[PDB]
Structures are given as C-alpha cells and as structure tokens.
Design a protein around this nucleic acid. Sequence first.
RNA 1: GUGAGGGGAGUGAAAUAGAUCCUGAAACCGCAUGCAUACAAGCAGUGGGAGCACCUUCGUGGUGUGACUGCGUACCUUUUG
RNA 2: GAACCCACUGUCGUUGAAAAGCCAGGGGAUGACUUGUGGAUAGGGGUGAAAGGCUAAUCAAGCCUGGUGAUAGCUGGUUCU
RNA 3: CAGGUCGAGUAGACCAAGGCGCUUGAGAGAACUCUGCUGAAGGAACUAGGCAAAAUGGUACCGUAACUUCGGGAGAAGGUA
RNA 4: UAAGUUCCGACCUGCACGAAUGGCAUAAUGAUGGCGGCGCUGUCUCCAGCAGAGGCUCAGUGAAAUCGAAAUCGCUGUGAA
RNA 5: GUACUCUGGGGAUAACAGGCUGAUACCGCCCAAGAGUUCAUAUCGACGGCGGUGUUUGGCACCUCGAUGUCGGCUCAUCUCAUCCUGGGGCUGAAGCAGGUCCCAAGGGUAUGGCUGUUCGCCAUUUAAAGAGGUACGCGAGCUGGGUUUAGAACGUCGUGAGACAGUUCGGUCCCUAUCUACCGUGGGCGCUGGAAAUUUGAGAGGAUCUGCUCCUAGUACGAGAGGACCAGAGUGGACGAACCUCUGGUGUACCGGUUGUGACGCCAGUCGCAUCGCCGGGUAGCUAUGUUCGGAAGGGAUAACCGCUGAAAGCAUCUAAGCGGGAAGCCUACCUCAAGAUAAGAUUUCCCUAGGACUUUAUGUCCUCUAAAGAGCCGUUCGAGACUAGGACGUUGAUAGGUUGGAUGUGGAAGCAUAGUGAUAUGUGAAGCUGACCAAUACUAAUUGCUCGUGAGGCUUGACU
Lengths: 211, 122, 119, 117, 54
Amino acid sequence: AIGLVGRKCGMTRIFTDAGVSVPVTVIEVDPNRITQIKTLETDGYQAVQVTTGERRESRVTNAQKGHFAKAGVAAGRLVKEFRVTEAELEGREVGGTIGVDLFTVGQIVDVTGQSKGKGFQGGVKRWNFRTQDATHGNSVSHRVLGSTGQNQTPGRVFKGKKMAGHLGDERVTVQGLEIVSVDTERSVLVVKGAIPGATGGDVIVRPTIKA
Amino acid sequence: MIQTETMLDVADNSGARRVQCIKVLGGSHRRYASVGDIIKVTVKEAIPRARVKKGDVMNAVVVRTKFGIRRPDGSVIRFDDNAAVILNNNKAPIATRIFGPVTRELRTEQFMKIISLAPEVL
Amino acid sequence: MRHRNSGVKLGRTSSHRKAMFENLANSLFEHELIKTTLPKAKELRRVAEPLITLAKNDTVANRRLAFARTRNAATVGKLFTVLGPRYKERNGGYLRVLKAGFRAGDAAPMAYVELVDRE
Amino acid sequence: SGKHPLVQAIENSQLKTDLPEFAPGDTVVVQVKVKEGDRERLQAFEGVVIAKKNRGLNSAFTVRKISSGVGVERVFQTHSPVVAKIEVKRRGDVRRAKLYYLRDLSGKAARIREKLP
Amino acid sequence: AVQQNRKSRSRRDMRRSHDALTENALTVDQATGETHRRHHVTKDGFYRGRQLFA
RNA sequence: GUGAGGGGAGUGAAAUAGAUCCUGAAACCGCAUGCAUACAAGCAGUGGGAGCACCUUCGUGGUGUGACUGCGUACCUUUUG
RNA sequence: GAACCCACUGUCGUUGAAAAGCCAGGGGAUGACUUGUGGAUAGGGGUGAAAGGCUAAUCAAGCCUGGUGAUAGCUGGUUCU
RNA sequence: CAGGUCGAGUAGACCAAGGCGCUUGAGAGAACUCUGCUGAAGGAACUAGGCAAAAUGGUACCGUAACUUCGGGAGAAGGUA
RNA sequence: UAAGUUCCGACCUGCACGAAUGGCAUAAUGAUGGCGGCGCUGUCUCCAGCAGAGGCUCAGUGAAAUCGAAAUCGCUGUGAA
RNA sequence: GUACUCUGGGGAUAACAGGCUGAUACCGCCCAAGAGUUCAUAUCGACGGCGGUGUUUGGCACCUCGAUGUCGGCUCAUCUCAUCCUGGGGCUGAAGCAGGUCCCAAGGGUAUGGCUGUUCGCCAUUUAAAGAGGUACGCGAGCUGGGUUUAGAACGUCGUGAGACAGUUCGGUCCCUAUCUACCGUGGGCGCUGGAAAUUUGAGAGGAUCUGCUCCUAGUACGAGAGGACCAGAGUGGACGAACCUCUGGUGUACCGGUUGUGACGCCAGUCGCAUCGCCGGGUAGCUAUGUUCGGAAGGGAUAACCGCUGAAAGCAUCUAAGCGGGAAGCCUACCUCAAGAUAAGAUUUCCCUAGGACUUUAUGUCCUCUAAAGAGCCGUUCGAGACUAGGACGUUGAUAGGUUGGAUGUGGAAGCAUAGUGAUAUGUGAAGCUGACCAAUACUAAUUGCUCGUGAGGCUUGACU
C-alpha cells in the first residue's frame, strides 16, 4: 500500500498518565514528493514513485536532473516505489506531497530497514551453535563447527548447511508496531518498540499487512 | 531466577528451614522460576518435632528473589535472599505464619493467605 | 566489531604507545618539523594540539599539568614562552601533515609533520 | 544532551519541574501510587539513597532499606508519574558517588554520618 | 592434506590470471613543472607552492 | 655505484670460440605471429566436417587451426575375474 | 623453605626454538645426598636397591671388517621386428 | 665475586657499578586458535573423575578431638590484634 | 541420596581365603587406589566484553609431504559386488 | 613358551565395515476349535497355511592384509513411516468424561537427573509427547579416550616350568599448513543488437509452520448419583526465532579517584616510571543478555480417508458407470527474504554523441587528420560498511575527518593561598578541577593544480503505419 520513507532518529520513552513507560522509536519524515505514476497501459502495474531529502546539484547526474525536472520537484537523496491499487491511486498526482497525516494514532504498521552489519561471523553467533567443553582435555576445538556430514553415503555436504560467513546488513521487516504519536508541527512519527538499523538510517513505514 | 540445585530459605513456619529446588514446573525445557512460580523442592533442614521432615519432596512457591522483578514503569525491586513458601498436594499454603516482605505478583486467588498473614507489604 | 571506537593500537602495549607519542610530541616541539609514518603522524594531532591549547594560558597549575604530560622542562618552557603566544589567536589546527612517499626499508607510507608558522 | 535535538525536545516536553535536591547518602521518603481496581492510595518507602543517575528524562535513583530483617532495594525512575512525592528527611556526608559497600554491612556498621551546616 | 595429482601449467596460469600490477596516480606539479605523485610532496620539498626546506 | 652486467671499437678462419669458454639433445621456463575458446559436463583421442589465415603450379592443391557431430572408462603386474 | 638434584598433573608444541622441550603448579633439600678430575670392569661378557634396565641418539645378545655374491619351494622385474 | 631500600634471607619488588633492546618490518583491529583480566542469578546441575580454574596463605597471642608405638596426631579444627 | 551397578557396616552354599610364596590388625608416613562433606568458583545453565600474540593486506627472503595423465558436477542404476 | 619379539609372503585365509542369501528375527495376511451372561469376527483367538522387510543371531568367503585404523560420549545433522504428540475419520460390549481397535496423515515438535566406561537397564521428578528405524551399527585429516587390545605389578585358578585365562585389579604418547569435488561467504572478466544514470515485473529458490493452562458458553446437553461435554469465543504462558539498546545489568587496559613498595624529576610541595591495568572503588560511548519489542494471524483453491445428492446397468437397491457436492496441522497459494548469467539475458523514465581525406580486400572495409560527450575509474577526507574487496557520504560552489568553542555525562571537593590544630589532618576560596568514543556550531588543518578509460547516430530481411 501507500507508505512513507523516513529516517531513524533514536529511541526514547513515553510516560502514560497511569505511569506506564512505553519504549518508542522516533522517525523523522521530510514530506515525500511524487515523481512518477505508473499504470497498467504503459508499465503493466500500478505504483507510486516518491523522493525525499536533499541532494546537491554537483552530485545529481544529468539524467536524474531531467527525470526530476519532468515532474517539477526538487532532487532528493533517494527514490522509492510503492505498489498500489485503484482506490489508493485515486487522489494522487505527479508533483503532490505525502505527509505524516497519512497515519493516525493507534494504527498498526510495519517498518522496514537495513540491519546493522556484524561482518564475518562464526557458527556460535550466527546460528546459535553450542560450544564444546572448555576443559577435560579439549584440544583447540572450543568454538568450531564440529561434524559437517555423514560418511561415504552420501559423500558430500548438502546445500544450505549452516557455516561461518557474513552476518547482518540485510533488509529486515518488523510487523505489528503501534503508532504512538503523529507530530505534524515537527513532521515526526513516534512508534512503539524497536526498528531495524542504526541511527540515521533510511526506513519505510507501511500499513500492516496482517489484516 | 531460580533453577535446579538452588537453595532457598523458608519464609514461613511449616517446619522447614532450608529447601533445595529439584524441578521447575510448567513446561518442557523450562529453565527459570521467578516470583509467583511453582517449584518442586526437597527439605534439607527442619526444626525438630514438626510436620515436615528432612528428605520430604514437596511443592513450593517463590516469594523473594535476588535477581528481582520489573514493574510497568521500568523500576526493579531486589531482595537480599531467595525465599519460598511450602504448599500441599493441591498447591495451597499450609503455614500459619509468614516471615518477611513479599510482592504484589501474588494477588491471585491461589495466594491470598500469605499476604493476609504477612506483616509488611510494599 | 569496532563501531564508533577511537584510538589506534600500532602493535604496542598501552604504556609503550603512550610513551612513544610523548617522545614524538617532544621531538616535534623541539625541531618544529619531523618525518614519521602516516598513521603515527595522523594520531599525533590528538596528543600534540591539546598541549598548545593548554599552554595558551600561563598559570602554575597549567605548567604542572604540562609537566605531568611531557616530563620535559625544556618542552614546558618553550610551550609557555614561544608556542602559546604565537598561536594565541588561532582556533585550532596548529599542525599540518603532508604525504611524503614510502620508506625504502619496508615500503611504509611516510609523512611530514610541520608547525603552521614555523619560520 | 547526547541525543539529537528532536529527541531532546520530545523528552523535554515531559519533564517534571518540582523535584527537590538530594544526593547519595541522604535518607528520603518516597510516596508511591498503588492502584488496585478503582482504589488509589499512596504508600511510603523510606530509606537511604545509594545511587543517582542524571540523564534528563531517563534519570533514576536507588533507595535501600531494611524491612523486618530483610534488605530491599528499589530503583525509582525520577520522572515517572507513579512517584508522587520525594521528601528529604536527613542529609548524609559521604566520600563517593555510589555506596554499594553498604550491602555487606549491617547494623552499626552501615551508619551514615550527618552533613552539618 | 596434499594433492593427489600434479596441477597442470594451464590451471597454474589460470590461477595467476589475477596477479597483474597497476600504475600509480601521477601528476605534473604546476609550481615546479616536475612529475610527482598525486597528493604528495615532491622529492625536493615542494607542495602547492609552499616549500619545506630552505 | 670507479660495482655486476652489457653496447660499440679491435683480434681472430670462427666471439651464438669471451673465460665453468668444442658440439649444446630432453625434461622445464619465456617472448612473437596464425586459428580456436566465456550456455557448456567425463582416459582428451578417433571417423566425419563448415569456416578462417598464409602459400600456391590457382587445384578434385599444400601448411596451421578445428565450430558442430557418431563411437570411445590409461599402462604394467597378478588373477576365476 | 632458595641454590642444587629430580620428574607427579595440565595446557602448548608434534614438517617443534628442541630426534624428549617451554610455561604454571609439584617432590628431596646433613644425607642410603649432589658434584669435578683421574682410574677399573667388554659382548653369551660387564654392570644392575631388578625395569630385560643400561653398555656413545643402537640392546631378548653393541659396533666394524671379513666367511659373503650366506640361503629364500616367497614377492618384484626382465629391453628390436 | 656479588652493592642500596624494605626483608629471616643469596626469597621478592624497584634501583647502583656494569651491560643490553635479543638480525625482517609497516598497517589492519573479521571468523577461528593461543595466553590473560572481569562477569548478572545459580553454585558441580559438568565430567569416567571438581580435570582445569577459583580459593587458603604473614607475625604475635588464645584455643585445639578421636586415636597413639606416648615421640606424636597438630600449623588439627577455630579465633583476636 | 529425591533417586547410589560405586562406598561403609553386617550376614556366610568361601565357583575358586588361610597362617614366614606368612594370617589378622595397627600410631605415623604416601605427587598411592575408592567414597562423602565445607569453602570456592565460567566446570556447567549459556555464554558476553576487553588486553597481548597469530590469522588478513603491503614490501623483502622463501620451504614441505604428495604427484600415470586430466577439459576433475548431482542423482538412480550397472559393474572385481 | 613368547604380550620382549623378528623376517619373507597372502584378501589364495579369519576378526570390523560392504556384498549375496533370509534359516533365525521383526511386520502383515488366510482359515477358524473357542473366550466373550447369549454372540467366532466390540476385543482376544487354539491346530494349521501364505507373504513382506533387510533393524537381530547366523551361513558363504566376492572387495580391502606394499593398512578401508574405534565401544561409548560431545558437536553437527539428513532421510523413511510400520505415527509418540498435535490434525481428520469408521466401528464399539460408544450415556457423558474417558478408553479400545482400524483407516488417512511426515507440517512442526518430541525431558532433566542418581548409579555404571557403557549402548542398554533400573530408579526420582517432569512433559502435549518423552516414537521405531536407515545413513561405514551417520559423524575421531571435527574434539575426547573412560572400556577393549602392547610393554610394569598383584590376587583367584591352570601348568613341573617358561607362561596362560567362560577372570579380576592399579598405571599407561591420539600426527597431518587442504590440490580436486562438495559446502558457507565475498569479488574480478565478459555477455545481454550504440552508450549511460536510476526505478522496477517476477519464471523460480530459500525461511517459517509447535503447543499448555485459565475464563466463557454452562454446572448447560448427558446421567440414578458421582461426574460432566461437542461446536463457538476471549486472555495469559512454555520452548523456538528475529530485530534493538529507551529501561535493568555485564564489560568498558586511551575517563576520574583512593592507596602499598621502590626510583627519579636539585630539595619541600607537586608529579611521573615499574610492580598482572601494581592493588582497590566507580564509570561515558560501543558491543552485549540475563534486558526490551515483535512473529508463527486471517483467508482462498485442489484433495486423502470418510460422508453424500440424483441415477441406471440389474423395473428393486445402489456415492458412479453420465452428471453434481462436502471434506485435514498435509499440497498449491497466502506471510518474510533473495531473484533477468530467466543466454528465454524482460519493462519504464530521463540523458549523450549529427567531422573531413586516401585506398581496395567494395565491405557494420582498412589506414591518416580532427574530435573525447553523457558518465565510470584512479587519487584524497572517511563510515553505525568492511579480512582484502564490495557498498555509503564528501572533495572549497565544502561540515567529510581532526582540532577549537559551547553543552551534556562521569568522578567526587584540583593546585596555590589562607585559617584551626603540637601533629597526623580539617575547613574556605568552590561541587572545584579533570573529563576516549556523545550532541551542536565553527574553514583553523587536510580533502590542489589533475590524469586515464568510455566516442563521432548504432548491420540486414520482412511486416504494419506513414
């Protein structure tokens, strides 16, 4: 559905009048500008393309400059698409603006981001493998994988075997988060719970898909 | 945060003085028991001439822990000891007095007796 | 991982590293122009510049702090009588680091460290 | 103030403005709201402040006391609405910020000497 | 652990197909006219007009 | 680099006879030219076979390469094998 | 309980720094003690608070040279048409 | 042969006289390996086995069981400054 | 012990103890074999962070065992099985 | 006699694992004396008979003795279904709750301890459940080495003895830097019908799939009573997984302080070196679990056993032969991630290049002169990105890094001076001084003048529009 592109600003807490402390994440939103509308007749699917942020002209290439000039909007730091249906598509025109008023307090949303990168990691951290005994005669085999297969039959290692490798720095979606505050004066969304990625990262907020 | 082999004080006068946890109840592979959970204990030390004797295997409910408990506003309450109260086969208290403070996580129909007898409540 | 961490190692213990950087700072304050490796030169800024910032104000306590950090009476005297008055009106940036090729013995990258207004 | 200005503003919107001044070593009485069903009451908690954390809206402080021969510690969140009132009964004189050494002392050993004007 | 068969010259050269060297970034210094390594002081002590040695 | 090594000049019938110097094979390692080779599975050949490059008595010719294709699991010993 | 003489446990090392070690602990330490120099015992012999231990990194009979090209109903190999 | 401050000491820490920085370096600060330090709550549930680690540790004084070959056990255990 | 194929006490149908190839005990002693406690702990539940040495990158020097030849995939079947 | 041993040979010949076979083992079926108040077939089932599998004990001696080197434990698994739990059903000697037996079903799940070297077994306490098997009785170039099976020693027993064992007991060296296949990650090259910057469709692949208890329906249906529901709704847990660091904590050897010994800075005072960061008490960022939040929801389509509607063959009957339905944690979708090297190489928006000669091999022809775009890279300042790479931001028209200024935090009363004390010390100046990695400003220092690559309108044939 139609959503918003924002930037993660950090975590804090909100106190309710009953005294409950609610952990929250703050998302700063610069209003998204519509750059292109895609239709069945010319593209074969329905989507809305948006841009947000700022980018200097020396870093904007000529092709992108023409693409933005056609829509009549200022160049942003990124471009994104949202798949839409007819009803959501109604009301939107190239050059329009989508703001934080798209959401309401109490609404359930999904948040997508890029998780933190841990680099090259081993079995213990990456797959929750168990270590071998620290004492009792162990020989340089504390955090190693162990066995990786059977004997002559089948005489190989199967695909998908859990091994060491790169961990983190992936696209991750968290579902079922609740909108706690919608600050229109500051263009801010305050959601309950944690969201993927580091401070300053780009995030996507969409209405929940589970019902 | 009570597991097996953990020793606990007895915050009552049913006769036991020290008990040892031998099982955490309520699920397969369940590791820890906190305030308000049911455990199986063996009696290690008891006052002579009392209903409970050494080597008894009974049920108990945890009432105080050193690890603590979290509250909705974000606070934590920690005690200086780990303590428990003995129950019968129907999981009901059998003691007639209680020693020391306790927590609000016991406000269930199963556990009014301990609070009603307890002197100090915070 | 080393997310957002500061400081270098350079294959030395902590006390050895601290002593080495103190020696480098003393040599720089004496000669006003030195040649060293590039990582050492870049790390030397964070140790040398605050000494000038401190020496801008001449008090007994400041002199004793400078002596605690340098252990060189001549360095303390030159800092408080020459370099601080020279850089009294400059907002940081008293050193300049310039790449100077590689070293014959081990192909290590090298750099020049210079005071801003040397002569 | 190690956060972004937006977060700073959001937290500053909720700060309490009538805290008293207190330091580790002082003995305080805290009134805590207890809210069962639709009965609401204030319950007292009196003890020695052994730790203080100054982090704006994230400020906390730890109070220790002895209750019928059992020691109890509670970490209050300073700006929480459940904390109704803080009253400083007596000012103590100590030489450090965290008084964790008081956990191993009991009775006469854990006395705090008074700050005099 | 060791090879069961000797490796052929073709496979050896195929492995070495990634060993080529690369040129440095060189630039003509405008102040003195000499070729120097980019972003580096020249051999005689010149960089962006300023001179290091008297 | 008053180095090692080489390029000229000169000697000699001969210096690719120049000092661990007659002749200078093979394993092994380079540079150059021609053709093939980055959608395709295996003892690497064999029987067919298009295209290309050079030569040419211009050809039903010679030399190099070999897209595509049928068949095809090394040698010796010891063994019933 | 140091020096000195040993070698009970563990990690490491195993194409080792080392053809028997390092590190952290361990035992004896005025005695049936440790050690320098110079001598004696020689191979079916010596010596042994005794393990078939030691006798030049070699021991259920040392090393070297001869008999000697020992013998092998066994294994391998055996060259042009 | 072998000094100074503490010390019973030729133990130990830091120094003197006197010697050295051990014949590849510079960066980086992933998995995994080696050597160390700290660790919430639990405290042998580990394991063939408390293996390894953790813990005890000085001087003076008080006190100290069974058993005994009357010597011991014994620095028993435990405690104060 | 909550739970004891090990341990301790006793019983005796001793497969197949027994008196200088000594029998039954025994204070002290043992880097001796078995069992149980206190203290203590990363042995473990279940691992986390940090420091040094390698690993990785650059410059210099520069090994090893192995090796019929290789244009060296999966599965089911066949076949010195 | 040799376990103190040695040489020449054999997979011509044994022990382990493989192979053939299937007596034995396990599983299934046929007949049915009978048991079951009567009633062979609810559930058992004698005497006999026929098969399946390749988990047992065996038979053979085909592979390996110029070596295929392991009983159990640990770590990590993968498949089967003859199903342990959860799901759907038929019968019942099925009132209800439960139970018995058979059919369908492999998506997920499927204990901790005491004893022993154990596998196994017994025992204690749990759980919805603690299934049976194959994979060299899976896994030792991944760990261990307690048992067995070298050399020492002892007991019982046998032998005259050297010595030995349907036995027991104490002690006793586990090597290998990974070439190829496989697997987990991460790059370079070329291709994709002129080149380039972005945004994308999804052929397809992987991940996930579990379940307890309480309330309610309702003390209702059922029942003499005791007991006590189907269907349909809420809530709250266990285990597992992911992301995160606001909260609670751990670490935090470049942050602050206390303190012992020694040496030095001429001395006092004040400091520094070394002693595991000398020891001790705290602690900012970052990382992190034991902390916080979230997930396995709901819905479609085709089906398994099973239950049907109408309906003849066969005037009746009959779920089937024509025709039309219902039906499961299982299948395809659905949720998350990857995905056009998908050589079938896809799509959309925008941007760039519109010069002359010579010749012959007259062709997207080869050589000269001019031209060098859109962009990419080299280089530099660097990063919450990282082994090297790759990826992200910036390079003066600049906040990319360091420094500087301000703030915040931590520690806890700096030095000097002055007072009160004989003195150790205490108080004031003053919550002072110092404060890695954090927040905000600021061109002071460093990101210079640059170079290389990438071209000059993009073959032909047919068709439809112009």
